[PDB]
Design a protein around this ligand. Structure first.
Ligand code: IJX
Length: 129
């Protein structure tokens, strides 16, 4: 893509420690799966392309971008050590949306729908075994 967009967040790095946990499996099989197929998921399924969207200030405002395409790759390629790292990525994605956009904007109502589902599923994150 455009040189004016930053590289996406890291999804592969042999130096980073990684482990499978039952909680991370739940985050893939339940949480990501639930959110990915929601009617309002599509704006969140890949990094923001600030050039295509004509948002030249996006990556000036949002210095820790995150999206569900990145999270999906991190889960499927076993990038994480623990569930907290992945939950933080989802929280970062929502908070970026809420910081960049006006309350009540369509993109914010879409994010809020996904976050409500997220919260319900994370309240049920299984005990680590
Ligand atoms: C994820 C996100 O904020 N995307 C986005 C989409 C459209 C506009 Br307009 C602003 C931002």
């Amino acid at each position: 893509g455009s040189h004016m967009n930053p590289p996406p967040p890291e999804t592969s790095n042999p130096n980073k420690p990684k482990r499978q946990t039952n909680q991370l499996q739940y985050l893939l099989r339940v949480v990501l799966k639930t959110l990915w197929k929601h009617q309002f998921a599509w704006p969140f399924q890949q990094p923001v392309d600030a050039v295509k969207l004509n948002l030249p200030d996006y990556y000036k405002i949002i210095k820790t971008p995150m999206d569900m395409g990145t999270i999906k790759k991190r889960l499927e390629n076993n990038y994480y050590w623990n569930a907290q790292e992945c939950i933080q990525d989802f929280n970062t994605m929502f908070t970026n949306c809420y910081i960049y956009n006006k309350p009540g904007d369509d993109i914010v109502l879409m994010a809020e729908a996904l976050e409500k589902l997220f919260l319900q599923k994370i309240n049920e994150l299984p005990t680590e075994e």
